[PDB]
Design a protein around this ligand. Sequence first.
Ligand SMILES: Nc1nc2c(ncn2[C@@H]2O[C@H](COP(=O)(O)OP(=O)(O)O)[C@@H](O)[C@H]2O)c(=O)[nH]1
Ligand SMILES: [Zn+2]
Length: 278
Amino acid sequence: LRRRGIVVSFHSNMVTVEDEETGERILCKLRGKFRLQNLKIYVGDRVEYTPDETGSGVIENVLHRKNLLTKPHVANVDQVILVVTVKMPETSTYIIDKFLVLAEKNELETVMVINKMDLYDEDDLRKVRELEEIYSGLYPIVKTSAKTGMGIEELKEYLKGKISTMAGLSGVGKSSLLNAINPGLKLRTTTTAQLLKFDFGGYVVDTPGFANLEINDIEPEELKHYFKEFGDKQCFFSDCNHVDEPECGVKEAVENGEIAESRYENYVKMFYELLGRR
Ligand SMILES: Nc1nc2c(ncn2[C@@H]2O[C@H](COP(=O)(O)OP(=O)(O)O)[C@@H](O)[C@H]2O)c(=O)[nH]1
Ligand SMILES: [Zn+2]
């Protein structure tokens, strides 16, 4: 009879589902009119199927998704674990804000993780204090070391229950942190993502988030809504883009220091970058 499950991967041209109750990995086939209609199914999709245990099962229906990450297709993602690096990979605030813009656009909770702390000397630490100085009040920050183990237990606290996606520049330590959180687990024909179950309940995606940092589906005038800070600020004009406009609460805030310059700076850069399109 009808049982609820979460899709976790696509094996041998078939959907692999996991039983929401207390189930194992039941392989499946989608039947019905999903054919007639165009109701596509993805990893992370919640579904209800028929347990013909005498050989896997059959997917009867696919629930409605809260969202759908793209390239590595993933549905119903709650969190973005943004792993950042001050030294070694060197992460610019610009890249960081593009990541946040993306996480916000897909309406996801974001947890910023400054990794490789074990490698930082005094100058590096200063750069760290600058990251906290910028993002402290906009997002949760956790200082970690995949090697030392520093900050992992605290990070396990955010992964619990939720379906999470790792994001960050190559080399920043995404796969190493994963293994630090759950020995054995690791980041990545077979072009679809997979959901890895955490020891403590919850899942993390096979491959990394928006690795292609593609901000195009965003209209210029839309971008401003993806910078938390820009909101409680009042600007003269109706829907002021905060760039040239004559009077801007946002521009005012920057001259004050209520808004980090880097934030404004990167937002404007991104703004103009989106304008170049017809
Ligand atoms: N010292 C130190 N090295 C780390 C840390 N995390 C990852 N690394 C190293 O950084 C390299 C890249 O890590 P990896 O997890 O593969 O990066 P990813 O591309 O973000 O998944 C590997 O050679 C690791 O040995 C960390 O917290 N501290
Ligand atoms: Zn404005």
